[PDB]
């Protein structure tokens, strides 16, 4: 198999959760959520993650309740059988951006942005792969590589041609704790948060 | 049954749609592809069949995307014959969906269909 087909091997970063005695860095998780909400949520769903699971991990009870109440969910119909909405609660699952697959492909030129609840375990490389994909977008594809209009080059992606454009840019997000929001700082935070979503 | 809007399908691009739970491959073949398809010697095919017996309109290659070996779905625009490659046991199919190499014994099966203006109806 040609190197292009395989994809560039994702290198071994020093994740603080790596190691038998190491837990997650919950500060990194809390930041990753913010990055997911402000940058990833517009295209990617997090269907298997329920609001209540955040409480006591990266946010307090009241914080999650507020975030949850910002979304509308279906409620039991009224006395006349008319459909009516309701604000979200802790027992609900984090909502996706699209109502269905057809809509999802429409907003992304045919491609379907996969759910990210298990993306860390659903890929060879895990965190290393995710982080490397998010920070490994060159500005231009290597010479002689024909990129089909609608694609973006990324060496870590098998085939090198990915339908997701680079979305992480310096200080595109304003961290609550004032941490320098660089592209790699954000990739390290989402990835850590995504690992928690998966495990 | 099921319909497909051929007006949408660009030039040399593949489209996979579901019909009776099985996948149906439809390609808008380029002129070069149409030639490559009808210019192959039968003696180089374990399952001899002309491109003409497989397509009603040279522009639209329509077939069931089921590898005749053990069932997997061939990957499009892959393999050593400018066609499809089955990742399961290494079966290569050409730009006409014919079996060229590997354990598969037959060309990708052509389902029943009819044209109707800008769209086709499989079933």
């Amino acid at each position: 198999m040609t190197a292009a087909e395989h994809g560039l091997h994702a290198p071994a970063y020093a994740w603080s959760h790596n190691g038998p005695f190491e837990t997650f860095d919950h500060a990194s998780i809390r930041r990753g959520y913010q990055v997911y909400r402000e940058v990833c949520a517009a295209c990617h769903s997090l269907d298997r993650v329920a609001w209540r699971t955040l409480v006591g991990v990266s946010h307090t009870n009241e914080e999650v309740r507020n975030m949850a109440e910002e979304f509308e969910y279906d409620d039991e119909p009224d006395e006349q059988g008319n459909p009516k909405k309701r604000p979200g609660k802790l027992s609900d699952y984090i909502p996706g951006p699209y109502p269905n697959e057809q809509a999802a492909r429409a907003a992304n030129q045919g491609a379907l942005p996969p759910d990210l609840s298990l993306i860390v375990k659903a890929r060879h490389g895990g965190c290393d792969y995710i982080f490397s994909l998010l920070t490994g977008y060159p500005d231009e594809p290597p010479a002689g590589v024909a990129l089909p209009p609608g694609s973006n080059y990324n060496p870590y992606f098998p085939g090198g041609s990915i339908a997701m454009a680079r979305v992480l840019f310096d200080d595109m997000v304003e961290y609550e704790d004032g941490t320098p929001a660089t592209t790699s700082q954000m990739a390290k935070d989402v990835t850590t948060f995504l690992n928690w979503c998966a495990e | 049954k099921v319909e497909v809007n051929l007006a949408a399908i660009p030039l040399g691009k593949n489209v996979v749609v579901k019909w009776q739970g099985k996948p149906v491959f439809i390609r808008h073949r380029t002129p070069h592809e149409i030639q490559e398809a009808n210019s192959v010697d039968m003696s180089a095919l374990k399952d001899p069949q002309t491109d003409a017996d497989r397509v009603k309109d040279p522009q639209w290659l329509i077939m069931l995307g089921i590898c005749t070996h053990l069932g997997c779905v061939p990957i499009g625009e892959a393999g050593d014959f400018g066609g499809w490659f089955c990742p399961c046991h290494g079966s290569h199919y050409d730009i006409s969906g014919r079996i060229r190499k590997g354990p598969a014994p037959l060309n990708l099966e052509i389902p029943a269909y009819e044209f109707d203006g800008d769209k086709v109806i499989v079933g």
Binding site: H9, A12, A14, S28, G136, V145 | -
Partner: protein, 74 residues
């Protein structure tokens, strides 16, 4: 503050190994653009690309930056 990873990559692109690697790629990039200018390039099928050279370079940078990057992050 500028991206820590971008800095590290820039630093290592300047080592002897890095410069030789970018040279090898750039040498390839030239041969390719000249190939694209030639008459009848579109119909070759045996078109050259510089992914291999690029991978060799990116691999070198990764092997150097991976063990250092997180010490520079929060």
């Amino acid at each position: 503050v500028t991206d820590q990873l971008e800095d590290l990559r820039e630093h290592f692109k300047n080592t002897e190994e890095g410069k030789a690697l970018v040279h090898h790629y750039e040498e390839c990039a030239e041969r390719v653009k000249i190939q694209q200018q030639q008459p009848g390039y579109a119909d070759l099928e045996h078109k050259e690309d510089c992914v291999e050279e690029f991978f060799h370079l990116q691999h070198y940078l990764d092997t150097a930056t991976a063990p250092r990057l997180f010490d520079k992050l929060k």
